[PDB]
């Protein structure tokens, strides 16, 4: 109905807190997830005090109407939160307790430089806008922050849910505003990626490499090109389930390296056949004997260099 | 309007009950399903008691307003249920009968270790938050729990729909709460998986193995690599449905084993030709005759071991 | 506001009726469809009786409020109907005319035993719940039941829209309810399925069979395995439409039979080559000549048997 | 709030017009499209006549309430339109000018008999239902019918947007109703289909036909079967971009003809090889040189006949 | 409740301004993106003037009701925005400050002529309609226009967000209207496309070209046709994320040129084999040596010409 009047000069302080109940539906393409949690607020209003002896009660219960409630919004949400008030209580001195359960979809950027073995941080921002007659600042109540024991994401490990206790005050549209930052840290479960993606590609690459122990041109052509087609199919299967990155990643580097190796293998087979046709079998034998050892060693060294470069 | 007054300390007891009508839309990747059921509540309110003889009626009907109604909320739902009140009736002694019809989307984790032949248990949780003046507890009315005989699920068999009688009481956010558990047990129908998945893969594998009765190198290479491409296509088709799992599953183990077998077959085909060209035409014959019997027996033993480990 | 009082015990009778306008969005996977139609109701309420001479009018129009309207609900709908009242009229003797337009999604199971050439029946259930003081029973008004001439379902032929006159009365949750069934019968348009799906598969199978007129092992292997790879794509394309089927269907039987035929053809080619290697060409020639006639005749007989079984 | 008093028992005529603002989301699979436009109405009400000299004002302005406006609805919409009245004005005479802005999703069947080069007409129906005390008929005002210049559809050209002046009066549900038809004619932009679909298929077919200039049986088998596989792979994307509405069409006939040509080419290659084996090379050469000219001529004649038949 | 009365003839002026908070979900196929921003308005209303000295304050606060608010609406939005008022203030002179946070889905065409290396401009249009007694015009307040520092579009770079000062006044439905234009200029991040799309295609094309150093017909046929299949798969992958293009585009021209090159390569291989069969090795060798250099040079020149033509 009206913000509480300042006594002399003090701004109004609202102590916040979020208690997670569920987090689900993490989307890699759209970089969104859905949340479901409690919201708690507490401020000071001297106009709601009462005498317990005359009233005969301890805490009074109000309704959302006929009481002043500060406006709290989330910055990074696609739509306004769907909320319903649970309870409002008033202490004899004037402190008010407010509890509310909501559900919303949050927007948060994701980093995919280390996609198979990466870790992310999800942000939720709370902001309040000062009224004409009063300045409002936010705070953190550590006794109201937590997560449910059964909170789970599909394929992720939840590590912690904390909040930065220092709000950021700045001027926006002729008014002062205060913001809070809630951080959720998670890690990816990478076990299922190994036998599903990594080892089959190695097997296909080795099958392609087995052409260095043969002199039949047609068989080598069949081997290498068919394995290339299989690699293309697997590449689509992999790079169908992640968004368009702006910078270089790890998976892209590995896939490009594999394409390079296939091209070089084709060149080697062509060179061997062309030298054999010109009745120079010794050079062809030397070249294929060298390639047999050259390919795996270079592959291992390049993979080691990339692994150090991205995870070092 | 206001919670009913206690006598000395007796907590308020609310009797619950859910009668399923339609359950459908079970999503494996989203791990959700949609429900449609009745909800029945009953409690005692001495303020509404009346003498039937004076009023001349046995049951009085009230609108949802002007009557205190406990707040019952589901825990694991994406959004608050959309419900409408059907009937409210008041007994002469003050007992109130309540009935509403709702629909909601339920979040429930799933287990995919024994994926083709698994059984699941879907959970539905009720909870009520105690008010400041009065303490509220939940209960189960065993005569108002059931389901329609017309309930159908696409690919599942309904086994039972029960409720755990004893609630769980805990203090959350400085208030006491009570929680109930409703469990729906289902089992998968697995007959259609056999001729659609299992037998075509076995036929493709046998077609691949037929290369041990041939001596031409190009034909063997063609057979093995083309069957590998077919296997890759089938693997993608199968993985279209099953979501990511943080542990080993039966299907993943089988698929990885098949990839390993293809790799070993390619190695054997290469070895035979290399020995043949090296002017040793007897060791090649020995190796081929050995592999003819070695491959099927080892495949059978490995399948038996896997079926023992995962289903025992 | 309050149901009309009975004379002695005679239950209130409500005459129903549905007039279809649009039917669209029939989803096979979800087994749903979307409807848009009218809804006519008519009952008796003697408290609304008036005489025409003193009133000066023949019919009185009422707003939806200030009058008792029974609660009519559909059973198999994802959400309650989105309806808005159109007209309300009152006869001099007490009869009331009701009319409204709605739109909802109807859940209906489907049968895919004869999927290319099947017929389906769709059910819409109407139910009313008795109030504490009066019992309500539904009836059917045949003059207000029908469908529009412009109703269009993509790929389906609408045949009839009728209702079973006798309702089914049962006791649910300590109250009596009456249920009515409206049945929509449709047939599938199968002609487009012939040149899109059926004939190309026969052509590919014949191309595969053409390998019985050649003795080149590599050419036969190429033909048979490449045609198998071609068949797999068609199998995926066909299977990606229908939902999972608990029982055995026509299409699944045909596809499994085709897989078996490909396997037997591979076996025959391998046997021919192995016999030809051992310098016994007479047996190979006899086997090839026998298979040339054996394969098409057995295929035709198996198809005739399957067609007789699944359609008789 | 009542219908205007009847004058000489004459039906009440209203003038209507629609001015398009946005047209978007033309989903051919569901045969729907969303609209966004204005709506103008006008009729006569003697009760609203006011003296301009005494009032001192030119025209009046009324809230939607305390005045009667006829109920106008769209027949082919999924749900009721979302309308918000903009202006209500009444001239010094009895005429009243009405305006509102709405948005809705419209149902309209589409025909794909000439898919690449087809044209469509989209219908929007307006209906008014007579009341128990008056008859209402519709009319079209030419100056209020129009279309915004910025209205765009992805891949379509907009031709015209007119209305049929003549209504359609009929008795439905024992009431008289009038219908107006607003037609929006569009045509598809078909140039991008040539270099994306038409020419690659011709190139692949010619690559297949190149097998009439060689005698190597293995090479011919490889060419023909691999090009068939490529044709299937291309048909995958062709169906990916093609509307998912099964019916008879031009593209389906073209694809079926291509499959038939591939089958005949395989038959010819097999015949040539079989004749060459039996030491009758003259017949094989005659058949080959005849087919070299026979195939393109028959293909061109079949294309001409189909094009004349479907588009003439 | 009533527009402000003019002094003599001055039209009402409303100063506008939009401050972006979040823009996201840029869809190429649907040509849509979602926005979330502030909206600021300011006009003169002398009916609300007061005296600060006698009132004892400096700024009054009002609800959205009991005050006249101009009806500002967007044009190219799928539905009406979801809006909630944040603040309303009144200056003693009469200037009203209005603030509101909204969210909407915007329609805007895109140009795909230079798709890998293109830039786009996104338009937002505001419009107001003059009332029967007053004329309203729009204006731009540059101090209230800006974008948030955390605004991000996945795969795009944001350049600027400005607006045109001059509105476009025109008459629609016999009422004057004023329209503004806010422009958001963005650029595409093209680096990721290089190693994911461009280089693999070059490698596949070179593998195809390697057939000019061999003289085995079967090997050349296998190489060329298998690389063609790989190109078709890559074409499907590229065209997954792209809408229909009314005019010729860069990528379409490149893909068509690649198809043409494959066809010419097949022609060359067939010609070489046919010449070699007729015992004319000299012409075959000359043609092969000529093509070895002819193909890369022509490909490079055609690429340069296309790049100059489209990016001129
Ligand atoms: C080759 C033939 C044998 C193949 C066996 C199948 C592959 C087994 C991979 C096991 C990975 C593992 O230990 O778990 C991954 C696990 C992740 O833990 P979460 O449960 O996701 O937390 O990672 C680890 O910490 C273990 C590190 C494993 C390294 C790789 C092992 C060697 C694999 C190739 C042989
Ligand atoms: C644009 C440029 C790329 C154009 C397409 C290139 C496809 C790959 C070509 C393969 C080359 C094979 C030629 C070959 O075998 O030559 C052997 C040739 C014969 O020489 P003499 O013994 O005197 O006879 O000797 C060699 O081995 C020379 C080295 C050739 C292989 C290394 C060069 C590869 C260049 C690829 C560039 C791609 C970027
Ligand atoms: C990582 C590297 C991946 C490399 C992929 C190709 C693997 C090798 C393919 C098979 C090569 C066979 C060579 C061969 O036959 O040599 C003959 C060779 C030696 O006999 P002599 O000539 O008297 O000496 O005999 C044999 O083949 C005996 C068996 C040895 C090879 C079999 C085991 C290889 C297993 C590789 C697993 C890699 C993971
Ligand atoms: C080879 C030459 C034949 C190629 C075309 C075979 C299919 C033609 C079917 C046309 C008749 C369909 C028809 O009349 O449908 C209506 C009617 C409706 O049945 P109810 O009344 O519900 O009993 O359908 C039938 O009678 C069903 C008849 C089933 C047997 C014929 C269809 C066989 C189709 C598969 C043939 C083999 C395909 C192999 C590759 C796939
Ligand atoms: C598990 C079982 C499947 C494992 C993989 C199966 C590979 C396919 C079988 C290949 C059989 C080839 C037989 C061959 O080449 O020799 C023919 C052989 C040699 O003749 P003789 O010298 O007189 O002795 O004689 C024959 O014709 C026997 C025919 C046996 C094969 C036919 C039955 C196939 C059985 C498949 C099992 C699954 C069903
Ligand atoms: C060799 C030729 C290669 C280019 C073929 C297309 C060039 C002609 C395009 C012009 C079409 C045109 O005029 O369209 C408008 C006009 C509209 O007429 P209505 O108003 O309905 O009377 O359309 C027509 O008249 C169309 C007439 C038939 C066009 C046939 C075009 C070629 C069709 C494909 C032939 C080859 C098929 C190859 C395989 C395709 C696999 C999908
Ligand atoms: C049941 C229907 C499907 C049956 C299986 C079809 C497989 C493909 C058939 C291929 C036949 C090729 C045989 C061949 O070349 O024989 C040549 C043969 C040998 O001549 P003579 O020395 O007199 O003996 O003569 C010919 O050229 C036969 C001419 C007919 C071949 C064309 C028609 C093939 C059948 C089409 C069926 C379509 C359905
Ligand atoms: C080896 C050959 C080169 C391989 C790398 C290809 C990319 C080279 C260009 C990278 C830099 C792009 C750049 O400057 O973009 C900005 C700039 C934007 O200009 P506006 O502001 O519109 O004026 O873009 C340009 O100027 C583009 C100039 C033409 C670039 C041509 C790049 C090569 C094209 C592909 C050739 C081979 C095609 C192979 C198959 C591709 C299948 C999709
Ligand atoms: C409809 C048109 C499409 C028809 C299908 C395309 C078939 C593919 C053409 C293959 C031609 C191969 C024939 C060949 O090499 O002949 C060589 C032939 C033999 O000459 P002599 O020794 O005197 O006898 O001489 C030549 O080189 C002829 C010229 C061949 C190159 C030009 C062909 C181009 C055809 C383009 C048609 C499609 C557009
Ligand atoms: Cl919010
Ligand atoms: Cl809830
Ligand atoms: Cl309903
Ligand atoms: Cl409507
Ligand atoms: Cl708007």
Numbering used by the authors:
A (entry chain C), B (entry chain D), C (entry chain E), D (entry chain A), E (entry chain B): 5 to 316
What does the report in the manuscript say about this coordinate set?
To explore this, we prepared a nanodisc-embedded GLIC-Y251A mutant at pH 2.5 for cryo-EM analysis. Interestingly, only 2.2% of the population adopt the o5 state whereas 11.3% of the population adopt i1o4 state. Comparison of the atomic model of GLIC-Y251A i1o4 built into the cryo-EM map with GLIC-WT i1o4 shows similar conformation with backbone RMSDCα of 0.40 Å and similar pore profile. Therefore, the functional profile of GLIC-Y251A i1o4 should resemble the GLIC-WT i1o4 which is partially conductive. This suggests that Y251 is essential for stabilizing the outward conformation of the M2–M3 loop in coordination with the outward displacement of F116. Our cryo-EM data yielded unexpected results with 86.5% nonconductive channels, 11.3% partially conductive channels and only 2.2% conductive channels, which suggests that the Y251A mutation reduces the channel conductivity significantly.
Gloeobacter violaceus proton-gated ion channel (GLIC), a prokaryotic model of pLGICs, is particularly well-suited to stabilize preactive states under suboptimal activating conditions modulated by pH. The GLIC homomer consists of five subunits, each with an ECD and TMD.
